[PDB]
Paper text:
PBMs are mostly (though not exclusively) C-terminal, with their COO- implicated in binding, and are classified based on position −2, being respectively Ser/Thr, hydrophobic or acidic in classes 1, 2, and 3 17,18.
F HTLV Tax1 PBM sequence matches strongly with SYNJ2BP logo at p0, p-1, p-2, p-3, and p-4. Accordingly, Tax1 is the strongest SYNJ2BP binder in our interactome. In the structure of HTLV1 Tax1 PBM bound to SYNJ2BP, p-3 Glu of Tax1 engages contacts reminiscent of those of p-3 phospho-Ser of RPS6KA1, confirming SYNJ2BP’s preference for a negative p-3. In the SYNJ2BP-Tax1 complex, Glu at p-3 of Tax1 engages similar contacts as pSer of RPS6KA1_−3P, while Arg at p-4 provides additional contact to the α2 helix of SYNJ2BP. Yet Tax1 matches better than phosphorylated RPS6KA1 to SYNJ2BP’s logo thanks to a basic p-4 Arg and a p0 Val (Pro and Leu in RPS6KA1, respectively).
Author numbering:
A (entry chain B): 348 to 353
B (entry chain A): 3 to 422
Write the structure that this text describes.
Amino acid sequence: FRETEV
Amino acid sequence: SHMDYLVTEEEINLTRGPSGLGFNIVGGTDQQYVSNDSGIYVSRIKENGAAALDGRLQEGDKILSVNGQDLKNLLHQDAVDLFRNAGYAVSLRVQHRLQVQGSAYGSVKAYTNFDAERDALNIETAIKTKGVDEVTIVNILTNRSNEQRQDIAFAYQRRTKKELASALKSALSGHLETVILGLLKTPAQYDASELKASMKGLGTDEDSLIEIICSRTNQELQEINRVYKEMYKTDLEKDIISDTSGDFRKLMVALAKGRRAEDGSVIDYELIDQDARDLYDAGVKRKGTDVPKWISIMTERSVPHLQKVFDRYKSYSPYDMLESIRKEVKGDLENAFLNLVQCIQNKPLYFADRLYDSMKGKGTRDKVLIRIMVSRSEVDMLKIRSEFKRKYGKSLYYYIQQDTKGDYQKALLYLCGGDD
Ligand SMILES: [Ca+2]
Ligand SMILES: [Ca+2]
Ligand SMILES: [Ca+2]
Ligand SMILES: [Ca+2]
Ligand SMILES: [Ca+2]
Ligand SMILES: [Ca+2]
Ligand SMILES: [Ca+2]
């Protein structure tokens, strides 16, 4: 579960 | 009373700032957000950010493409890189998944992140914990819609080779068992089983038979009639005939047919007056009562029509419809007409009054309390609660809390859905 800010 | 998902696709154009586009993403072929989809999803929208101020992007949206490049079957990092290198003017194509509830006035809503297999596993775990973990069972089942419970039951049977209702029948007892088994039936199955229970054995539970038959609509009654025959291998009408007699039978049989006129767009003012005058001439105006006339008008006309009939009736009669019933008839027949007129005039207030009566005195009429909380939780419980608080001054939640205890209380309070 990687959550990446864009 | 069924839920729906509205899946729509939308193009959204944003301007990147120092803070970026203002949202987070999850997913990818190497980070599958669920078991199946490798899609890219919006997991969070930062406040006061680009996506937030634009207002179109939603948490839970799937990102289909960035500046024309599809995000299908990508590694997480390859999707991130499309965003990092998209420039300051970013064009997104997104897929919205909007959950639509079956009723706007229900207290129990469909659960958003629903996984039937996970719920079935967790319930099996709770059943097999030493002493039975009732808290988990209540937490899950009272916070899923009836349709979601049917999906849990299906997954449970496949996993365990046992029916979920039977497993919980064995694991539970007391009033809590009654609530949980009731929640597991479809609405028609539940009403059919409650009707059978009101008649099976010597005598009749007229109170319960009247409550169900007087309050259900044509659509609900048609499905009850069908399911009753499947479950019990006889017609509901034949059981009503077996358990009732006289004018009370005529009224119950007539209502149970579910052949009331449907609501129309044309108000029949001439018929409104004729019906009102006929009700007066059949009752208060004469010696005795022409009960067949009352039965025909009150079972055949649409509910909005009869609301106007009862108002016009007061132009002719010194007493309103409810007071006229009390003066004219008695016994089971009076009880039936009074319930029916209340259901026509204000059905949520009818149920609020029945709930108050089930708790107001010593102990609890648990059978009535449970049946209303189960059967109305996905129909009009929010209106019931509003009428209850207005009339009695404290919330339905408050009365349930004083009258019940334990996990049974917890379950009823979840079905209530909140305080007022
Ligand atoms: Ca226990
Ligand atoms: Ca049991
Ligand atoms: Ca009987
Ligand atoms: Ca009785
Ligand atoms: Ca009379
Ligand atoms: Ca009377
Ligand atoms: Ca009480």
